[PDB]
């Protein structure tokens, strides 16, 4: 309780843990192999986030980075979460649309670069250079969003209508929520320091729970995850 | 020689190195693609463990974690080993039975969570919280063992008898040996500190060599690794 | 500018960034799924290297390792680069020849061991043991080079001539350039310290740009990357 942001770390931990259990239970029984992929991916995403939220809450996932003449609290465990959970989320989208393997490789690799350069930016001790890493990471994010909108135009002649519908919704959810993360980082504790860490942590908790549990509710309620038969 | 546990690190290094060379030589010549997968996976497992045993023996893979009012010797390199070798072992099992891709994803991801939360527990400076990580990691292990016994019931109508037989043996080997690891950690140097590090290191060496070289001897002697023709 | 090797880090950053942009633009429009794999892999390789070159240039990717009675400058970010980019390069070769999945697993796993043991060697504080890690890593490299020459003899009865031709060239490029890396490390800052860091950094920059951008120019100009139709 001694860091003001504890309450949002504790609520994030609980909501990710509850979402994990819900999806775990929801997927019991599923035999359709395509459906099984989606449940597996979509359950792992909040399970991983539960662990990293808990590491932040307990303090393990916090470090102090000197920059700006200050010791700055930096929650590094978010990058360990996102390193795995953001390619998994892209994989759910790419599987919806039957993406080509090269497109998946492009997505997962640009996502790696996005999270890894965000982590270097987050731990960089020269203040001005933190924003060079931010810009590179943002360029990788823009590439991802570009591919999600313009990279699947060979696939629309052979998409089931329900897959197109669910993919469109989830792609919109993704673009809107993910685009907020660089803005929060830029104005928050890792960037300009205009928004205090407590509010930052709240913002990321709302985005994370929506981008993981909200996303997954939409996906796992859809008939698009089943091979049709 | 100055740490009492050196002798078990040196024997583990030698046995993993010898097992690697044996499997490397055994797999020379194999042309069956299915067989080649199994040799590749099963040889990489002790090769990786050889490297991490050597890093422990030379001291690189040891760190001191303060907790309990003490500087505690913690061999972190075991988590770097297991991060790769325990999904590889699961992959050998999953390939035996032709698992669905979603099942493989579930297994490898729960295994990631098991090893990563074990590593956080191993490096956590608040003593009581180390056991919260232990419990989460154990829950992931139980999930894995659940899937290994109850997750492949679509596959039994089209399993060759020899694949079913070898998978049953290896699955039993896996459940018994892997279930001992949380117990050793709980009573050893990373947990309650009731068993000294020297004996702990012996225990993990016996389990590791059996779970990697013993496992692999059983697998690579079986006709189940060949496509049948 | 305060480290003499800055100029080669800055030129490496620029050449990797330019090569990335060139390949990105070159691959726009490509619809052939096989071609898309090769563009994706081959573009990610210099993009990752651009980021790690920049981290070296800005100082983030440098650490001081005590060994030999000295504080030694060690650029660790090269291992973070190579961890991903050297399996990606092997994947391009393995895809050319339609390698079996077990062969790919062997290649990527031996490459992991090569880079991870090179990183342990690079960070080891006991000088003589640094060269034990070097020898293990070199053994893994030799295994890789062995597989590249002798591991694809089931594949030559069903290789398109242009794929055989491009694979031969790239395999030769690979063997020659990669074999120089252990020699540079052995005589440079991480090893015997006979070649100063500034010249070392130059050597690795020439090798990296050739092994990534030179390699990729050869590959992406070839008709071998297209499924034939
Ligand atoms: C079954 C397996 C998964 C293995 C079990 C692992 C794990 C679930 C164990 C629970 C972790 C949790 C108890 C950590 C303890 C936090 C904290 C209370 C420690 C001491 O703090 C006490 C006071 C001090 O004034 O602050 C805090 C005062 C209050 C006591 C704060 C309480 C709020 C919670 C800590 C926040 C909820 C986190 C939960 C783990 C959410 C899990 C969801 C669930 C339904 C799956
Ligand atoms: C239930 C069986 O698993 C379902 C399969 C098939 O649909 O999908 C796979 C379902 C999921 C992808 C499986 C995810 C792995 C584990 C079940 C996650 C639990 C491990 C840890 C206890 C961490 C999560 C704790 C929780 C409270 C967030
Ligand atoms: C298919 C499989 C069979 C293949 C597996 C092969 C493999 C098992 C072979 C043996 C592996 C073994 C050598 C692993 C050793 C661990 C290694 C990190 C040791 C180096 O030192 C570690 C710590 C010291 O406390 O410093 C840290 C060192 C440096 C300061 C950081 C080095 C950077 C990393 C090498 C790159 C990865 C960093 C991130 C974890 C990944 C990207 C994260 C992103 C968000 C930035
Ligand atoms: C600091 C920088 C990010 C620069 C800020 C401005 C910049 C983000 C806006 C320019 C993006 C640009 C692609 C917009 C042009 C749209 C166009 C190409 C698409 C064609 O028409 C499609 C229509 C609907 O049918 O609009 C639908 C729109 C299209 C599908 C294209 C939109 C894709 C974008 C990637 C989504 C914009 C959100 C950004 C990622 C915001 C990033 C936040 C940042 C400040 C960190
Ligand atoms: C070919 C490639 C793989 C590359 C080569 C890499 C690698 C195999 C090189 C060998 C590593 C090894 C020599 C490390 C040295 C350990 C140690 C002796 C260092 C100094 O210690 C001396 C005394 C001090 O009183 O203690 C110790 C006294 C004794 C001298 C202890 C000796 C016991 C061994 C160190 C334990 C065996 C480890 C082996 C590497 C096992 C390999 C198996 C093999 C058949 C593949
Ligand atoms: C022999 C050719 O390789 C066999 C293929 C096909 O079956 O499988 C692949 C066989 C294995 C999966 C290949 C594993 C990679 C390396 C051969 C491992 C050696 C690299 C290092 C020297 C570490 C191991 C040293 C040893 C003494 C433990
Ligand atoms: C398909 C491909 C092409 C995709 C590849 C994309 C990629 C190559 C893009 C560029 C990668 C690049 C940015 C890597 C940089 C390395 C990175 C670790 C730098 C951060 O700082 C590293 C050290 C400082 O000494 O601190 C450490 C930082 C923190 C203290 C720890 C951060 C946590 C990690 C980010 C999560 C991984 C940790 C483990 C190694 C993995 C799980 C282990 C488990 C057992 C806990
Ligand atoms: C601290 C906690 C671990 C709690 C300790 C007790 C707990 C591990 C025991 C309860 C597990 C429970 C699933 C047992 C019920 C069996 C049942 C569901 C299977 C149905 O019947 C199958 C028969 C043979 O045909 O028995 C064969 C048995 C079945 C195939 C099911 C057994 C699967 C288990 C995962 C194996 C038990 C070993 C544990 C992993 C021990 C963990 C050690 C721990 C203390 C860290
Ligand atoms: C669009 C997205 C990718 C996001 C943008 C991220 C990124 C491209 C931003 C550029 C990074 C760069 C400006 C870092 C600054 C380095 C340095 C000048 C910092 C201060 O140093 C000043 C003096 C001191 O005497 O030394 C140095 C004096 C000189 C000023 C040195 C100048 C040489 C360059 C720093 C080396 C070139 C590096 C480039 C990033 C190459 C990129 C290639 C491009 C065409 C894609
Ligand atoms: C262009 C669309 O992408 C092409 C696809 C299909 O061929 O391949 C995929 C093309 C590549 C594999 C995509 C690589 C991911 C990003 C486009 C790389 C840019 C992210 C960062 C800004 C880092 C690179 C900066 C640059 C200056 C080196
Ligand atoms: C398919 C997916 C869904 C699966 C994903 C599962 C996963 C998301 C589950 C949760 C992951 C989570 C626990 C990650 C936590 C990060 C972890 C590194 C925490 C440990 O401590 C990290 C730092 C402290 O600053 O110390 C560092 C600790 C030690 C000093 C080093 C430990 C070694 C590593 C565990 C092994 C990897 C090291 C390299 C980055 C990889 C190989 C590099 C090579 C070149 C040596
Ligand atoms: C310190 C150690 C590395 C030892 C140094 C010496 C050692 C590297 C040389 C012995 C390698 C050995 C396989 C050579 C025998 C060749 C033979 C098996 C191939 C059969 O005939 C093929 C012909 C052309 O048709 O030659 C073409 C040649 C073949 C295709 C085989 C060559 C494959 C090698 C892996 C390439 C040699 C380069 C090395 C990797 C150099 C390593 C540098 C080191 C000092 C760190
Ligand atoms: C589950 C959590 C999700 C979906 C997180 C998404 C995170 C991003 C899209 C992060 C983006 C970043 C930037 C583009 C710039 C640098 C800062 C980051 C890493 C926050
Ligand atoms: C090759 C080595 C093998 C098979 C290692 C297996 C390790 C485990 C099953 C580890 C399990 C753990 C727990 C369930 C709780 C926390 C402690 C661990 C990581 C030892
Ligand atoms: C893109 C960069 C490339 C192709 C780098 C290749 C690096 C190697 C082949 C590294 C090899 C090493 C050894 C065999 C011994 C130890 C030192 C290393 C890691 C430099």
Numbering used by the authors:
A (entry chain A), B (entry chain A), C (entry chain A): 5 to 233
Question: What does the paper behind this entry write?
Answer:
Bacteriorhodopsin (bR) is a light-driven proton pump found in the plasma membrane of a halophilic archaeon, Halobacterium salinarum. bR is one of the most extensively studied membrane proteins, and has been investigated using a wide range of experimental and theoretical approaches. Seven transmembrane helices (A–G) surround a retinal molecule which is covalently bound to the side chain of Lys216 in helix-G with the Schiff base (SB) linkage. The proton path is composed of charged residues such as Arg82, Asp85, Asp96, Glu194, Glu204, Asp212 and SB. In order to elucidate previously veiled features of the retinal chromophore as well as proton-path forming residues, we performed high-resolution X-ray crystallographic analysis of bR in the ground state.
A dataset with a resolution of 1.29 Å was obtained from a single crystal. The dose to each irradiated position in the dataset was estimated to be 0.1 MGy. The structures were almost identical to each other, with a root mean square deviation (rmsd) of ~0.1 Å in the superimposition of all Cα atoms. Therefore, we mainly present the structure from Dataset I in this paper, while geometric parameters are derived as the averaged values of the three structures. The structure consists of 229 residues, one retinal, four lipids and 30 waters. The structure contains the loop EF (Thr157 − Glu161), which is absent in 1C3W10. In addition, multiple conformations were observed for 8 residues. The high-resolution electron density map enables us to recognize the respective atomic positions of the retinal molecule which is in the all-trans conformation by means of light adaptation before freezing. Our study reveals that the side chain of Glu204 in the proton release group at the extracellular side of bR takes two conformations. The occupancies of the two conformations are refined to be 0.55 and 0.45.
